[PDB]
Design a binder for this molecule. Structure first.
Ligand code: FMN
Ligand code: FMN
Ligand code: 07L
Ligand code: 07L
Ligand code: 07L
Ligand code: 07L
Lengths: 359, 359
């Protein structure tokens, strides 16, 4: 099975091509993770996936999506990850982390607590920042504050510090969150970036925050560990061919700047779109990026059945298959997949105290 | 659905009728549990089952099955359970524990490390104890040492101390392991008990160790928390009707002695048997015990599909359905079952960070 072939990137070898993508849990308190996360993550690692990427972890308090988001904006926050990292490694999975800044989509309620921008008089909320003072709209009506150059320098440094902390906590894989309408994506998109300085207008200027952040992170992140990013390569906003062309150009600049793998996603930059959700719908888009930027890729949003995952790999659309919601339903999804695909000794996807009995 | 109706026994209410029976993990070191157990158990609790019974936990070092078995023979061993108990409760499951003594089946290898009695010159092994100096045979050839009266008094006290420790660690449900050919079962069975003192010969004498241990435990275990036992009610050894009759009589004496629920199992006392393994095969036996001893029951060994579990409850064969191996395969089996049985808001079997996304 292609799904169960190992994958080596830099000095890291994943035992199979199943990646668990970042999935916010909304269970942290002032950014500090706890036993929710410990058990959740260690349990997923034991389920057999080759790579487990920890949820969007904010580089700064105001860059959380919600009051429940994880953070890594101080050394104490970073140290809270150490036992989790160690548990993931003990289970034979590779520990990764997505470092993030929610930009104009920050200061929101948890998804089961309204999913909308927090009210102005709620003591939990905070001012959001973005490239331009323009609201997302819909359920996220807050107008963010337009960043100064000093704010840009500060946020870049926060990404550097977060990467250094992730390194020192023992993570073996990092993902910069430049997708999903959050800060990085919003610098790239003309919908959200109306700046007239060096950080807006032209393709080079809109790319600048992302490329400078990647370069700054690269200074502290080890050369021998995968340096990756998530990026929304189209919006489904009626501008897809032009947007894809630019996104692929940016992916070439990421590759030239040391990016080892790109997690290909959708922008979610604005609400007025028509995303064609369906099984493996991102496969052709991911394949195009892979081919035209000559960069390894992963993607998600509908690959969570064993045959879809296998087919995407065999067609060289993806290098890793990210499987999200199926792992919330069943932490041992990799074992399920091994069985489905007829892998020999499928139960030994799991550790001995499970595998022995499930042969 | 019957499977998702709550159950109240003494002061404890289970959110549904799914019980996770004790399942040895073979991951402890000198009886001390660790992060293997913490994550395993907390993950199962979050999966939705109403009751989670911790694996056979030895009351004394020599009562472990293997060098990997959990123990509770000192206060330090007990204190290791405290954070696990707290995690199980945080997830809304009821924490139980099975306290045990392996008798002649002790000093064995882990099941994936030979499953047989440990060699005499292996520094890990130890002398086994039993009612009589008679080996199990087959892969367990060691002849145990015949217990003295003082040994009987000491082991009973070890069960008392274990129960007191379980209570003080915060467990809300206890199960005495009088099944599976281990020490208690072996006192009951004429195959293994050839004693000619007060603890062998007649039905009363063979029952005595079990009834005295139950009574001693009852002195320290709170009246308001379920006091349960597991007991093999037949062997499939050609003596089933006579054995079942005696087992049911003993179950009546357990009930009279304060037992709140009986986990009905098979004896496994000797190897030369013909157990008719199959789906729900224990249902009729459990039902007979339930009816003739007028005692709530659970059972296992083939109820691990949602329809089998539901059918057993609706037929009043069982009060709780114990589902073991299916939970090793999928820690979220209760969610799977809720979906299968068409329970409303089935995803909310799981906590919000999963449930919200799986609606
Ligand atoms: C609970 C939940 C939380 C998520 N949090 C993040 C996140 O932290 N960062 C991110 O880039 N994507 C996040 N996503 C998107 C997932 O990584 C993934 O792309 C999505 O679940 C689609 O894949 P699937 O169809 O296999 O579920 C999240 C999705 C879910 C369901
Ligand atoms: C891994 C494993 C370990 C077990 N350990 C114990 C134990 O500690 N005590 C016990 O009474 N039964 C033990 N059993 C028996 C289970 O509780 C249960 O009866 C058995 O798994 C049958 O139920 P199932 O068909 O749902 O798996 C164990 C079974 C398994 C698979
Ligand atoms: O998969 C594993 C195997 C062993 C193991 C052992 C200890 C522990 O804390 C975690 C573990 O994860
Ligand atoms: O579908 C989701 C749910 C939460 C979520 C949170 C962050 C993100 O980047 C993407 C997300 O997608
Ligand atoms: O099911 C739960 C819900 C919340 C929760 C919160 C913290 C924790 O440590 C464990 C938990 O288990
Ligand atoms: O099937 C099993 C495997 C291990 C095991 C261990 C203890 C016990 O009481 C019963 C058991 O049944």
């Amino acid at each position: 099975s292609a799904l169960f072939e190992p994958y080596t990137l830099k000095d890291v070898t994943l035992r199979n091509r199943i990646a668990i993508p970042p999935m916010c849990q909304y269970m942290a308190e002032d950014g500090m993770i706890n036993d929710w996360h410990h058990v959740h993550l260690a349990g997923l690692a034991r389920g057999g996936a080759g790579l487990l990427v920890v949820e969007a972890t904010a580089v700064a308090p105001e860059g959380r999506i919600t009051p429940g988001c994880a953070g890594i904006w101080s050394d104490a926050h970073a140290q809270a990850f150490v036992p989790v990292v160690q548990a993931i490694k003990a289970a034979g999975s590779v520990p990764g982390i997505q470092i993030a800044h929610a930009g104009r989509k920050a200061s929101a309620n948890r998804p089961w607590e309204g999913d909308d921008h927090i009210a102005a008089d709620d003591t939990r909320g905070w001012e959001t920042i973005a490239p331009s003072a323009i609201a997302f709209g819909a359920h996220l009506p807050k107008v963010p504050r337009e960043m100064t150059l000093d704010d840009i320098a500060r946020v870049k440094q926060d990404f550097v510090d977060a990467a250094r902390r992730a390194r020192d906590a023992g993570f073996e894989w990092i993902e910069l969150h430049f997708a999903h309408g959050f800060l990085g994506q919003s610098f790239f998109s003309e919908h959200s970036n109306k700046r007239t300085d060096a950080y807006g207008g032209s393709f080079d200027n809109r790319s600048r925050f992302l490329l400078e952040t990647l370069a700054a992170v690269r200074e502290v992140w080890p050369e021998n560990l995968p340096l990756t990013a998530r990026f929304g390569v189209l919006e489904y906003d009626g501008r897809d061919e032009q947007t894809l062309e630019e996104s692929i150009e940016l992916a070439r600049r990421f590759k030239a700047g040391g990016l080892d793998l790109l997690s290909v996603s959708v922008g979610f930059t604005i609400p007025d779109t028509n995303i064609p959700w369906g099984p493996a719908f991102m496969g052709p888009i991911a394949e195009r990026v892979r081919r035209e930027a000559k960069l390894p890729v992963t993607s998600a949003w509908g690959f969570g059945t064993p045959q879809l995952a296998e087919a995407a790999l065999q067609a060289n659309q993806l290098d890793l298959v990210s499987v999200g919601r199926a792992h919330l339903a069943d932490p041992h999804w990799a074992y399920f997949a091994a069985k489905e695909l007829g892998v020999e000794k499928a139960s030994w996807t799991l550790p001995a105290p499970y595998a022995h009995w499930l042969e």
